[model samples]
Target: MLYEALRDIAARRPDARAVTTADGASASYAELLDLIDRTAAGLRGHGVGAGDVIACSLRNSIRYVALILAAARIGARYVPLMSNFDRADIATALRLTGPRMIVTDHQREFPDQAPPRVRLETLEAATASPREAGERYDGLFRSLWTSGSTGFPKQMVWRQDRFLRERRRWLADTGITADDVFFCRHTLDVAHATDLHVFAALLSGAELVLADPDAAPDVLLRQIAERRATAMSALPRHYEEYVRAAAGRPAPDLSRLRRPLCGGAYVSAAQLTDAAEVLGIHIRQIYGSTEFGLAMGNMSDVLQAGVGMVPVEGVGVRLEPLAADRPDLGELVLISDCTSEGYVGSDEANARTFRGEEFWTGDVAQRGPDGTLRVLGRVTETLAAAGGPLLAPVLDEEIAAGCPVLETAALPAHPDRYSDEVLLVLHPDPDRPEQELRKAVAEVLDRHGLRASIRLTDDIPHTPVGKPDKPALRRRWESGALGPV
Candidate 1:
C-alpha cells in the first residue's frame, strides 16, 4: 500500500503538491488521492477485480501515476510499458503477461490477440461506484518485464515488503525528504527506475515532477533549473547531451539538484566529471539488475577511488571465485528479501539466474583490498582477449572514456580462431572522420596495453536497456556481415 500511504499523507498535508505535470500543472496530495480513488472506481466499473493485471502503456502524467495507485487500492498488479514501444514490442509484452487490459494514451492494435485498451484521459472523469477496497495485499505488487537482452523479456513478480525495503534504502542513501523534488522524464516501466524515483518519491512526501517522455535534453535541463529538481533518474545518453547543452550558453543552474543518477548503461568517468565540475550536478551511477532488485550503488562523486560502491543495507553480497589468476575478480551474487525467486515463466533462465536464496548477477566485479566493489563487465559474455580473458564492458568503458566515440563495444572477431582476435567497434562522433576516430581509439588501446582490430560504424546494436548487443554482433560477425578497419 502506497495508495493507503497517499491517503494518510493527503489527510495530513492536503495542500502539499503531490505531482506536477510537464506544462506546470500541479496536483495537491488531497487532489491526487481523490483522483486515485475515482480511477480505482473506474477500473471496477471496467470489470477489473483483485488479482487482475493492468497493463499501462500511457505517457508520463499525473493520471499514469494515479492509475498505479488505483491498481494498488484494488489489489491489482500494474505493469508499465514504455510510451515509445513499437507495435512489435507491445505484442511481445502482451504475449508474456496477458494483462486483463491495457490503459493507453491512444487507441492502437496489438499482436497475439491483444487485450482491450482503455483510454487514460477518462480515468479521472469516470463516476465512483464506491467499491470495497482490496485487502492490504503485500504480495505481487507488480508483474514487470525484464530488458530481454538475451531474447524475450520475461515477466517478474516481486513481493511488496522486500520491494519497499529497497525503496527505503534508496531514500536513506540519497537523503530525500519532503523538501526535495523528485524529477523524471524517462518511462516508468522498469522496476529499477521506479524503485527510487516514483515509489520512494511518494513515500518521502516530496514533489514529483514528470516531463514528457519525448522531451529534448535542453527542455528537460531548463525544467530542472526552473523546478529546482533535487533528485532524479535519467538515461546515460541524455546525461551526456545535458552536459554538452549546459556548455553552449549559460549553464542550467543545477546547484539545487543532488542525487541525480543514470543507470540504463555504463557511464564513463569523463561524463561524471563534467556533471560535477562544469554543470554543478553530481551525476552518480545506480547499479543492480532485474533479478535482484538492487544491492549496490555509489554514494559519492568519486568512481576511481579504489572502485568504491556500497552494498545496500540488509542485502547480503558474495563474490563467486573466478580463478587463481584473478582472485579479487568474481561474479557478484546478491541475497536479499526483495530478490525474486525466478521469472514467471522460463524455468531455464531461472535456473541460470538464481541459486536457492541468492541471485547470481552475470556482472563480473572487481573487489578492492578494503572490500569496495566495481562492476567490470558481463561474465557470461566475458570477451576472449589476449589478456587471456577480459570483460567486454570494462574495455568498452575504458576505450570510450579515453576516445571521442559516441559509443564503443569490444567483441571477439574470430570466435573460432586459434588465437581470438579482439574487435573493437566504435560508433563515431558524427563530425569526426572515420580515420581520426579509428586512430583515437587505437591510441587509447595502446595506453591501456591492449590490442584489437578497429571497426567504425554509424550504427551499433544495443539492448532496449542500453547494453551493447553482443549476441546480435556475434551473429553478424559469423555471417561475414561485420568487417574490420
Candidate 2:
C-alpha cells in the first residue's frame, strides 16, 4: 500500500522534497523512490523474501527510511535496532528477533547465531533494476519488540493491510497534508511514536525534517524554525528539554509549527502551559502504546484546561475500575485501527493483554464530565502520598516544571499497600546546589500535599525505550545502592 502510493506521488510531483535533514541535505520524492528501488534490489540480491527478517542498526539517514520501504516493497519484515544500543543490547535484539540478515552502517558485534551482514555501504548499487509490474504481496510488514519495561521483551507483527489502514486513518484524523513538514525527535528505530512522523510524511506526500535524536535541544529548536516544520510529537522529556533550552536563548519564531505533541509519558496541564508560554508552541499530550498505535490525543480545538487526551477517530476506549472505592478511575481498554492483533510468539502474553478486540492497557485513566480522557498512571505504578494515590509520571511532570534537573524518578517508598512517604530520585546538574534543590522540591511536594524523601544521584535507571525504570530503581533501593537525600 505504501510503496505504490509513494510511486504514484513521485510520478506526479517528482521534484517535491520528500525529506530534509538538519545537516542541510534533502531528497526529492522521485530521488527517494530511486533509492528505495536500489535498496529493494539489494535486499533481493541477499535472498530476502516474504516472511524473512532484515534487521538494521543504523543512525537516522535516507537509506534507513528507504530500507523500510524496501522491506515493504518485497514483503520482508524490517526489524530496526536503536542507534544507542550497546553490544549486549544488540546481541539481545538479534537473539530475540532472529533476523535472516543484519544491516549496519557501523561496526557492531554479532553472536555465533548472527546472520550474514548486509552493510549499508554495499546494499545499494549505482544502477536501476526495479521491476515494472508488481506481484501481489500478502502480509506482515514488520516485527517489533516491546520496550521491555518489565525486563522482558515481547515481539509483535504488523499485518500489512491493517498497518496501511491505520496509517491512512492517522493522516486523515490528524489532518496531515502534503504541505506540512513533520518533525520527529527520535530515530525510527528508537520508538514507535516516531513512526507516525516517518510514515505519515512519506505516505501523505508531506515533507519530513530528520535529525539525530541526540542532537542538542537548542539545535533542535533552531532547526524546527529554520526548516519551517509544521508538526511534531515526542516524549514529554523532549518537550521539557526544548522548553528548558528556550529559557537560555532567544525564542525562535515557531508560528509555522502548529501541532507540537508530547507523549510516552504523562504531562500535566500546567507543564504544557509553561512550555507553550516559553517556547511559542503549545505542546499537547498524546496517548498510545506499542501494542495499540496512536489512539487518543488532543485535536485542533482541544481544550487546554479540562482535557489531557481524547479518543481519536477509529479508536474505542472503555474504563475498567481499578478498585471498588474508586469508580471514577479505571484501567483504559483501548482498541484502534492500528492495534496489533497479537504478539509474535507468546500466547500467554497475548491472551493476558489482548482480549477479544480490546487491549487492556495497564494505565489508569479518568473520564472528565466533558467526555475527555486523563491517563493517570499505570495500575501497577502508583505512589501513596498525602494525596490518596499519585501517579509518579504526573508528579514527575510537576517536579520537572519547577526543578531544572537532568532527570527525576518518583517511587513509592512503601509499595505494599499505602504510605504517606514517597522517594524522589534526582539526577541533577553538577552545578545544582543540593540545599536549593531540596527547598524547591519540598515546596512542590508540600504544594501537591505529597510527602516525599529526596535522593540526589548522578544517574537514573531508564528502560530500553528511555522511560524511568522504577523496577530497577526499587531493586537498587532495596540493595542499599540508593541512599537518603
Candidate 3:
C-alpha cells in the first residue's frame, strides 16, 4: 500500500520537485521514491521488518522524511522523540517502543545508551530491489507520543484511514500545488512539522524546506529568495520577527512569496495588518490541535472573516445554547475525521475527550452570524475574577502585536481561587513599560473582570513547534523557581 501510493505519484511526475530544505538543498519526486525504496531495502537487509518499531530521536531534515518512508515501506512503526531530549527521556521511549533498530545521522551523538545504529545514508544507498513487491496494508504506523499536561508524555495512535484523510483534507484547505515551495522552521519531532509541513509537502509533490532553528533572519531571507519560497509556515512571533528583520534590508529579491501561515497562538488583527503592510503579503492564521490536526484555518480571507461565514468542506462546527442568564458566550465544539481514534496508554484521557464519537477538544470557540469559528481560549483557562470572565489568550495576543519582543504567554493563575485573574508572562519586551502594560491590562481586565499578575523572564518556554509550554511554566511557578517579577 505504501509503495503503491508513492510509486503512483512518482510515476506520474518524476521530474516534479519532491522536497527541499532551508539549507539550499532539494530532492525530486523520482529521486525520493527511489531513495525511500532503497532505504527500505537496506532496512530489510539489516533484518528490520513488519512489527519492528524504530525509534527516531532527531530534528527535521530531508533524512528524517526518508526514515519515515523507509519504515512505512517495511511496515515498521517509528517512535519520534524530540531532538532536545536527554538520555533519560530517550531511554524511556526506547524502553516503551522496544525498537528493533534505531536510525540517526552523524549529527546526533547518542550518549550512554547506544542501541544498534544504522546511518540514514547507509540505509538510503540501495536504488531498487525485488523485496519491494507484494506490498500489503501494514498497521506499523500506530502511535506517536507527545507531551501531555500530566508528567509523562502521552502516545496518540493514528488510524491509517484518519491519517490519510487528514493529509487529503489539509491539501484541499491549503491549496498546495506542485509549484509551491513549503518550508517549516520547526523540528521533525514536532507534530506540525510531521503532519502539516512534511506530510503536506510530500502529499502535494511540493518541495519541503528543512531549516535550522538558529537560522538568522537574513539567512532565512536569502534561502527563501533563492528557493523562490512560494509558501511558508511559522509561529506567530516567528513570522513577526521574520517580517521585522526583512523590512528595510535591500530586499532579498523574492518575487514568489505567496502564502505565509502562522500557528501556535492567535495572531492579533493589528499584528496581521502590520505584517501585511511590512512584508507586502497576506498572512494566513491557522488554529489546530495536536490530538487532531488543523481544526480551523484562515488564509487572506481571515482579515475579512466575520459572522455568517460558512465553514468550508470537511469541517463541522456547532454552538450549544446554554442557560438564558449566562452572560458569557456559548461553548463551540468541532467534529472532524482528523480527531484521533483514542489516546494510547490513556484510558481516562480518552474518556474525557471522547464523547459518543466526536473528540471533545477543551478549546472554547464561537460561531459568528456568518458561521465562521473563532477560537476564544481554552475552557480550562477562562477566568471569572471580579465578576467578569477573562480570555487569557485574547488579552495576551493584543499586547504582543506591534512589538519585537521575543514572545509572551498568558494563562489563568489560581484558577481555584480568583478564577477570573490571568497571569501574563512577559519576555524581553523592552518597549512595554510596566506602567503602560499595566494600563493596557487594566483596560482589558475591567471589561472581563480580569487581573494581571505580570512577570518578566529570560525566555518563554516552547515546544519544538513554538507552542507555549504552559505546564512547564506552571511547574516552575509552583516551585517558586522563577526569576524576578
Candidate 4:
C-alpha cells in the first residue's frame, strides 16, 4: 500500500526532490523509486517474500528509506531496528520477529542461530536486473519492536492498508501540503520518525530532509536554515538544546520554518511557548503510542494544558473511568482501524492489552471541559504522594516549569515515616549551581504542598524514544546507589 502510492507520486512528479541528506546527498522522486526497485529485487534474491520480516539495522539515509519501501513492495514486514541497540537487544528482537534475513551496513556479530545476514557492503551482490514488484500481501506489511521498557521487547504487526490510512489520517489534520518540507532530526527507527515524519512527508508530496543523526545543535540549525524546512519533527530536548546553543549567537532567519512537532514525553505549554519564541516558529505536541499511531495532536493552538484535541479522524478515544476519587480521570482507551494486529509472539500481552476492537493505551488522562484529552500520566507510573495520587509525568511537567534542567523524573522514595514520599530526580546542567537548583525545585514542590526529596545527577536514563526511564531510575534508587534522602 505505501510503496505503490509512493510509486505513483514518483511517476507524476519524477523531477521533484524526494529526500535530501545532511552531507549534500539527495534523491529525486524517480531516483528514489529506482533505488527502491533495485533494493526490492535484491531482497527477493535472498528469498524474501510476502509475510516475511526483514530487520534493517542501519542509520538514517536514502538507503534506509529505500529498504523500507522495498520490503513493503514485496509484502514483507520491515522491522527497523535502532542502531543504538546492543548485541543482546538485537538478538532479542530477531528472536521475537524471526525475520527472514537481517541487513546491516556495519560489521556486527549476531547470535549463533540468527537469520541469514545481508551486509550492505555486499549489497550489489544480491541485486538482480530490473524487475516488477512482487505480489502484495493484505496482511502484515510492517512490523516494529516496542521500547520494551517493562520487559522483553514485543514486536507489532500492521496491515498494509490500515497502516497507510492511519498515517494519512493523522497527517491530513496537520495541514501538510505538497509544497511543504518536513525535516526530521530523530532516528528513523522511532515511531514518530517513520509513522509521523517520513511517511507523512512522502505521502503529502512534500520533501523529506534527513539530518545527520550525530550533528550538533548548531549544525542542525544550519540545516534548517539551509533547507528552508517548513515543518520539522523532533524531541523537545533537541529544541531545548538548540535554544541553549543559540543563546549567545544571533538567531537565524527561519522565515520558512513554520511548525515544530514535539513528542517522546510531556513538554509543558511554557516549554513549547519558550521554544516557539526562541526558534520563531509554532510548536505542536504529538501524543501517541507504539500500539496506536497518532492518537491526538495539536495544530496552531498551543493549549497551555493537556495534549490538545481528541483526534476526530481515524482513531476513536474513550476514557475508561479509573477507580479513584477523581471521576474525571481515567485510563485512556483508544480504538482505531490503524491499531496493530497484536504484539507478535506475545499472546499474554496481546490478550491482556488488546481487547476485542480497542487497544487499551495504558495512560491516565482527563478530558478538559472543552473536549481535549490531557494525559495525566502512565497508569503504571502513578504514585501515592502527599497530595493523594500523583501522576509522575504531570509532576515532571510541574518540576520542568520551574527549573531549566535537561530532564526530570518523579519516583517513589522510601522515607522513614511516610510510605509514599516522592523523589524528584533532576538531570541538571553542569553550569548550574546545585544549591540554587535544589532551592528552585524545593520552592516549586512547596507551592504544591508536596515535599519531595531531591536527587541531582549528570545523566538521566531514557527509553528508546527519549521518555524518562522511571523504572530503571527506581531500580537504581532501590539498590541504595542513588544515596540517602
Root-mean-square deviation (CA) per prediction:
3.7, 3.7, 4.5, 4.2
Backbone clashes in each candidate structure, one number apiece? 0, 0, 15, 0
Identify the candidate with maximal lDDT: 2
Flag the better candidate by lDDT, 2 or 4.
2
Q: 2 or 3, which is superior by TM-score? A: 2
Candidate 2, 139: how far from true, in Å? 1.2
lDDT of 3 at 208: 79
Name the better of 1 and 3 by TM-score: 1
User: What lDDT tens digits, residue by residue, belong to model 2 across residues 85-204?
Assistant: 666777887877778888988777766667888788687867745746865454887877676455546777776677777778767888888999988767777444346688878888
Q: Is candidate 3 or candidate 4 better by TM-score?
A: 4
The superposed Cα distance between candidate 4 and the true structure at residue 206, in angstroms, equals 1.4
In model 3, the worst 10-residue window by lDDT is: 303-312
- For 283-363, candidate 4 gives per-residue lDDT tens digits of 777678778778877675443433455674667888887654766678888888777778877888888789988888887
Return the TM-score for each candidate structure: 0.87, 0.88, 0.83, 0.86
Give every collision pair in model 4. none
Query: Looking at model 1, which ten-residue stretch has the lowest summed lDDT?
Result: 476-485
- Give residue 254's error in model 4 in angstroms: 2.9
State which candidate has the highest TM-score. 2
